[PDB]
Subunit: 75 residues, 8 copies
């Protein structure tokens, strides 16, 4: 029910989780914001189709990171 | 069937249309952006459940406008 | 309402905001990093009933009022 | 003061802001493109004297309150 | 010469042209800026490997536009 | 007596001290009007000096403008 | 010459505004001080350096880079 | 790579970016209204293979380099 799930820690030191049903839903979210609220927040967990990707970096860099991964291998 | 459709004119003087499946999806998109790309753009058409609302304003003001409306009148 | 400000937004619609006191206005200036209306042209600025001859953006009102002598109104 | 919010700023000092009504709070949210305090952690959020159990940033308060059934207070 | 050429009109009504040696250079500029100075400026010409793409939009929308096009036909 | 009416020292994100000076109060006010957002606005102030007097200020660079406006500075003339 | 740099631009209310800098270094410090300058996207009606009208066509924000690329020594 | 800059981002990781010339760097500064890394601490700054004694944020590198006589190198 959720291809992409992202957990990050916000400036109040609380965990927040956002999900996207498809990859295209994630792309639309990136295109919609001039600046995302969470763009500078460290990512605690990035999962794609249930697979944990070993991502280290900010929420804002996820978009670029995803494009350079071979994603078809996750089924 | 999209519940919300918004057409606005961007800085290239081109009409752009975005859609949301639920009010919740629209609210989430508002919460996600520190600043939305389209927030200062004039709205050409705001449609809710197939009804054209009589909306004269910017994209960024839609959220506050919709919250003051009784949307139960639209079916 | 001690201060009333009318401006034109990017959809070319008139909008009006009011502040009950000068301190309410000051507080709204300190509260935003950027005000939504900061770059909007001002059509009318009213101080205690008086139409001030103001020509400029919403964001410039604060510095304008600071330099004026308001005790005469 | 129906709404009172205490938060910690970037100099590590506590600051408090108050809103006389929920509608005054809504107006302040609508007024700023970005609020100065939006990324500051909230130390206390009170509503009609009730200490709400809020854990989050100042900028997330608006969406939080919108979700709560405040009538219980 | 340059794989990507972009001409836009700035707020002084002057035409400005920027160029990128490769698509990856263009991608690097996009990732580097939180906000690019030209992002809201209308594009008058977008050229890819010498070919005028029929692009109608802002500078800021070019990246997503390019990502969706099949570029190996130029 | 003092070259600059306003001197401000703050700590940036690299944890280094930066000092800016304003020859007059008007120069400072002009600088506040000229920036939509100032680079240093969220930085803590380590020292705020007005006409050579270290004011006992605790806050961000961005909040100096409002602080000064509310102070009675007549005691410094 | 009163001020080394004089800039007139048109703000969003379509009014002419003029700012001056006594020295080039004052002008540089003002460009370092703002993350974003209020006037950066405003069109420039006149740019005067040491009393000389420069033939400047552009936005306020681009002046800094324009001046850095010019040989301004002819104006000394 | 004539200019090499290592900084630390919102997540102590180090990242390195390079520019082929001073002119290339200058163009990169003109192109962003705000650079993603502008507030990040610089851990190393190299010009033509020489480590410069730079203590500051990424965003302040430009004003630092502009004041140096780089022909020395
Ligand atoms: Mg400010
Ligand atoms: Mg971004
Ligand atoms: Mg490069």
């Amino acid at each position: 029910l959720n291809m992409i799930e992202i957990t990050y820690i916000d400036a109040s030191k609380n965990e927040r989780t956002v999900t996207f049903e498809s990859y295209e839903d994630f792309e639309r979210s990136q295109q919609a914001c001039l600046i995302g609220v969470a763009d500078y927040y460290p990512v605690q967990k990035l999962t794609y189709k249930g697979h944990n990707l070993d991502y280290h970096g900010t929420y804002g860099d996820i978009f670029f990171y995803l494009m350079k991964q071979d994603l078809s291998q996750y089924n």
